[model samples]
Target: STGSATTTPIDSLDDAYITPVQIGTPAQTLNLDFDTGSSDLWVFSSETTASEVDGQTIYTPSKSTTAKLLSGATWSISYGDGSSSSGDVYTDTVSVGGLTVTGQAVESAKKVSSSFTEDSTIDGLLGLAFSTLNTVSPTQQKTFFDNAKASLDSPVFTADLGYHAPGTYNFGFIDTTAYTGSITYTAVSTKQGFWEWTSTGYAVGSGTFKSTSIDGIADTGTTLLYLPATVVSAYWAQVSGAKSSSSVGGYVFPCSATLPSFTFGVGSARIVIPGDYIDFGPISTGSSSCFGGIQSSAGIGINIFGDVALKAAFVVFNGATTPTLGFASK
Candidate 1:
């Protein structure tokens, strides 16, 4: 029978919404960062060096009678933030909310980068990206959703991500009550292994819209919005005391600047990111200077519609047929 699951965010050190998931027999629960940016369900485990894990829960395979190792199979992955993890594979029952997928591929981490090791709240990463990006060795593995989609009433999932606020991740269905206005849809081009799309253009502070085409990914794992170099400078220009501070590593501005609302076009849907949200908190704790959440997509080849942009709207990652993105104001 087709079913769905709803995941709530755990209190986070960062904005990554942690989802509680049960894996294996007797169900040891883990709080995972549901990442749409990557494709690998990796976790801290008994395989991980004890010194490498702190305040994070580890998955014990021996305890789960249902767990089975895939001989010679392994996985290794790294994130844009320089965080990474890698290890052996285990096939076991993995459940979220009320949905279960037996024989799901669970990557057990033997090693993790400093970013992940220091992130005490994120026990693992639940990859929602296409399975084509899955990191299993010898034979690529299917994600829990990939295997469960066939049993779902509809092949879809909705990401209701928010700021430092609570949000829900829904699978196999979209909850209409969670958002207002009609959902506007746009065609997604996934050539780069991501929910990549082109925005017609954008405007700053009710100014004239520049008809520039931007190619980017709808990445929830990323915390800030990243755009082309020119677009970033143009937006910062409107804020007094805003400058490119090498010390801060990005655009830094006075916390009191009258930042303007930013608007972008998605087909015919024009969504606005309030000025307040543009001013991402301080550059550092107890510091007077602030970092601009919107930065230039330098070095990186593509732009990213990170949490700052996605949180402003309710996004639907429609994986059916030709995948498309559906957006609506929250």
Candidate 2:
């Protein structure tokens, strides 16, 4: 939603409030909910209940002094990551940094966690992955991206991670600063925003043990990447000076070393997931340890790359009419 001053006064007296909204632009100043969980943009409203607003942080609409609201719409969302919420949809005069698109959808949950619900800092999630798996229902007669697409710089958008900023989500381009490899692009399956693919195989260090094409979807909703059986085991074998011992273990490798890197083939696009992500979290197996990427999928479904994987690329989600998935940078 676009707003002037710290806050804008909408026609609050109406029995219903429909506020128009704008998804983020390529510019950093625009509020893009760079979430890989689901692909969409939303905001927090002053009207939200404490059950929804008390514990969770919300967007104040203070940045865009000209922000406004539409008069009659509501919606809800849920994630494959075991997270869910219910909220109202609003329309507002929208702006993305120097860009402006007037009619847009912004979702605000009346009840909200993990980080989004409890963090006093995160106002909302900006889904950046694919849309086939999106929980944002257009059945309510709203399309967050469809309307905003008319004004965006590209038919696509990219995410550059290692933002290097305090905690702000980086909205444009890919993070190529620490990269060294080839580019792989995959055709987006239309069922959902998810970019479904089969990993041709896996490799760690000098070992290319086996080649397995496992079906999976890249998600931004999760933090750790979850893989199937043996594949997960082989990965932990490569972290430098890494050992298999720890309580919260995945692959307990030293914080510093020539950690192994991985490249999974998706058509011609070889999306390279960094070592940091491979070892970001801790885990345990037997009396040993393994890093995060290769963890147990106890209650989760299929295979998911999560934020650890999605944040590594420049993602484009097109759910405008039919579902379209494409990636460019970071």
Candidate 3:
């Protein structure tokens, strides 16, 4: 079996992408951020504090005849950005695109952080990472993809994230027409429960490729590309007015600065990120300085190939006996 869904960027900066998901017997559709970096299918629900609820949609398990409480089950998760949520668990019929899974674990949020409350674009997050990363206590739950993979033609999914436009997430099979050129396959290490892979190297603008290994995770949950300080510095130095500002908390440059493109290697294949994509946006409304989409991963502990990098290629998460990642030009 196969399924497809449209993921739309929530804002002009493409800070996050949201996909509609159907939950419950009558189908309570809520837009959820599909995060490849974490593993827990959580959502804002009727149990959430009324004060914490913004304009976001909520899932009411009580309305679903198919819903059943997982006694003693609870989940809590915190992100790198300090945003977090905790909730009880329910098993219900959940559908994404055209694929349906019965008894899928649906975490109903009871409490949420201010960031989540303020961001009304997304109701919750659907984790795509390995089940080992699930934060559920006592009994861990499988992700929607993991639960449905047995019925799929292939245990694979692809991410086609767009810049400002809507993109797609395909489950079970790859749409060959979605990409150009051949895919470059690389080994993936699920040790950290992430889509961790190694890049051959990177280059600044039209410069020569640097032959070095850079290990990172392809995280759809994150908004920026985080690489080694050396790589980030090299790319930013090429911009005339770029500087690392402690006050601003990252590398920022004049809004009018002509930024250079960034290229990274996947085996022998090179994916180039357009310069305009790196400009991010102004630090503040009407500000003349803009934060860079690419920043140093030194403080982050590990490099992350977030949306800024994922938008440049068609990425495949192959759930084979020995999982691997595939990258191709779109």
Candidate 4:
């Protein structure tokens, strides 16, 4: 079986990508963020505190005839950004695009962070990472992909992210026409429960490619690209008025500065991120200083090839027995 769905950026800055998901019998549609960094299918629900609910949609398990309470089951998750949520668990019929899975674990949020409440565009998060990373206590549950992989034509999914545009996520098969050029395959390490892989090297603008082994995770949930300080510094140095500023919270440059493109290696294939992608946006409304899309990963403890990098290419997450990653230029 196969399925496909359109994933769209919530805002112009591409802060997050949201895809429509159907939960329960009659179907309660909610826009959910497909996060590759975490494994927990959580959602805003009727169980959530009214004070914490904004304009976002919520899932009411009580309304679904197929919804079953997972007695004694509970979940709690915290993100790198310091936002958190905790809730009860329910098993229900869930569908994405045309793919449906019966008895899928659906975490109903009882409490949520202020940041989540403020984001009206996102109703919840659908984790695509390994099930080992699931936050459920006592009994861990499989992700929607994992549960559906056996019946799929192939245990694979592809992400074709866009910049300020709508993209697609395909399951069970690879769309040949979705990308150009041959795909470069790389070994993936799932020990960390992430789509982690080692990058061959990097280059600043049109500079020579530096041979370095950089380990990072392809996180679609994150908004920016994070690399080692050395690599980030080299890229910023090429910009005339760029500097690392604590006030702005990271590297910032004059809005008029000419930014350079960034290129990273996946085996012998090189994916180049356009200069405009690096100019994240103004630090504040009407401000002349623009924040950078790429930053140092020192504080984060690991490099993150986030949306800024993923949007530049087509990414394939192979879920075969020995998992691997595939990158192709588009």
Candidate 5:
């Protein structure tokens, strides 16, 4: 029982999610998942039409005084969840926790997800993940993290998220007071990415697991567990009473009544998650009773175990330090 708490695009894990995103005089607030898996800072514009958007949080550019459109450039990002957004490029003064920079560029999607389009909670994405999976062309782009670090107050930053949920994303200030749990971190590779780590094993609730090699990105943008074929097969084979349903593939785990105690072991560290996470609901395709948090990413190709997979333990990635990615408990 406990509680707690990014360096560089990924010195320690994208700890800082909400960076100060500004355009001109008025700074529009942007909260992002500092990912070491992609490069892009896409937000919604006041000029976007509603009909094209579906399930995303749309940001109103008019809401900000500094919002500007990038002429002739159209942008549309399709999420792994099968949702898409399209729009023109918008330039603004994007700011992060400690720094506010002008001439910063952002994206405004035309077609959006209802989750992103209709919701007024937060604006669009400030994709600062990593490059191995960037949607941008030339395949390599310097992220806001790479650009913003030079001017940061401490050159060291971390994210302090609320327990077990997505919305509680924050940046910069990490109140380590409740973090007597563990404090080791990893260093950033020169990829201009947030940071990535290897998962030694996984745990659900309070189950047992053997040490294994698992790689994952700290995603503030996604919220599910995307495991590799073998692992997803083994675990759910036991839980679903079948070898991962025959019809669906990847990120889609059939609904179940009783979820086995799931947990992951990162070397000597351990993380445990609740079962509801696997249930995913209508957000998922065709199944309502599935594991809210856990899903089959076999179809998605990339091995990204999102929050649904992460909430199990206290997690960390780094662009600030080097070597091993750190994992602890809350």
Candidate 6:
């Protein structure tokens, strides 16, 4: 059997794709960010302090007959930007569209950083990474996909992320109509619980694709595309009036500046990010300077092909014997 969920953008930010999910009995609906970069399905809940939660909806386990506490189990997670959330655990029925996973481990947030609390629309996060990255203590928990993989017709899930529009996440089957052209497959290394792969080379604008092996992860959770400082320098050099701004901690350019395309290699397949994508929204509303979507990830040792890059392709997170990534033009 196959299942799919439609994803809509939150605010004007192309930061994430939010999908409706039902938790517990009687089906309390929650809109969650389907993040492939992290592995913890946590939601704001009744345990949250009134002051900590802003205008977000909270999950009331007491109202769900199927909700059962996992007794003393706890989970906590911190993001690369230092945003964090900690909470207790419950085993409940969680479903996305027609797919249902019985007794899925759901982390109910007791506390969340302002990053999450301020996003009123995003009540929770659905982790799509390897189950090894799960944050639950004493015994790590599995993701909804992992729990349901055994029953799926195929162990693959496709990410049809849209650009400033609604998209769909398909499970248990691959819909050929979603994308055009042949899908380029790349072997992935899940040793670190990430969809880690290597980009063999890159090119600035329409320049030659110079070979430079860069290890990186395809992260749906991250908003910007991060690469080595050296590569970032090359790309920014082509953009006139571009300069490093400490305030934004990355390169910034005039809002009217013309940007060149950035092309990166995936084995023999090449993906080029349109020039416009590099120019992220303005540094601040009505400001002449705009923050760039591509930045340096030198401190982290791994580059991140975030939403800025993913928006240009149809990606398949294939969880086969040798996990691999398949990409095609949408």
Give lDDT per model, in order.
Answer: 0.84, 0.48, 0.95, 0.94, 0.51, 0.88
Assess candidate 2 and give its TM-score to the true structure.
0.66
Which segments of candidate 4 are over 4 A away from where they belong? none
RMSD of 3: 0.6
Off-target runs (Cα >4 Å) in candidate 2 are: 1-32, 51-72, 113-115, 128-143, 163-183, 237-259, 268-271, 281-291, 311-330
The candidate 5 region of ten consecutive residues with least summed lDDT is 1-10
Query: What are the per-residue Cα lDDT tens digits for candidate 1 across 1-330?
Result: 344444444443235678889999989999888888888999999999888998899999999999999889999998887788899999999988778899999999999888888879889998888888999998999877788888777787788776566777777888899898989988898777788888889999889988888888888788788999999989999988899887778998898787898888787777788887777667778887988888888967889998778878888888897999988888
Q: Could you tell me which 10 consecutive residues in candidate 4 have the lowest summed lDDT?
A: 275-284
lDDT of 3 by residue, 1-330 (tens): 888999999999999999999999899999999999999999999999999999999999999999999999999999988999998999999888898999999999999999999999999999999999999999989999899989889999999999899999999999999999999999999999999999999999999999999999999999999999999999999999899999999999999998899999999999999998897889999999999999999898999999999999999999987999999999
lDDT computed for candidate 3? 0.95
Per-residue lDDT tens digits for candidate 6, residues 118-175, read: 8888998999999999999998999988998888899988887777788888888888
Q: In terms of lDDT, which candidate is stronger, 3 or 5?
A: 3
Candidates 3 and 4 compared by lDDT, better number: 3
**Inter-residue clash pairs, candidate 3:** none
Candidate 4's error at 308, in angstroms?
A: 0.3
Report the C-alpha lDDT of model 5 over 1-330, residue by residue, as the tens digit.
111122122112222233234444554444444443456676655556767444434457666677665566665567766766665665667655445555565666655666555444345566656533444432233456545545543333344343323322223333455354785453334343434566677644455676787766556556566777676666666565333445544334445456665676556766655555455443245745343355556676556656555444444444453423454555
| Model 1 regions lying over 4 Å from their true place | 1-14
RMSD of each: 1.8, 9.1, 0.6, 0.7, 6.6, 1.2
Over the stretch 119-141, how does candidate 2's per-residue lDDT look in tens digits?
Answer: 44445655545444444454333
TM-score of 3: 0.99
Give me the overall lDDT of model 1: 0.84
Q: Give the Cα error of residue 173 in candidate 4, in Å.
A: 0.6
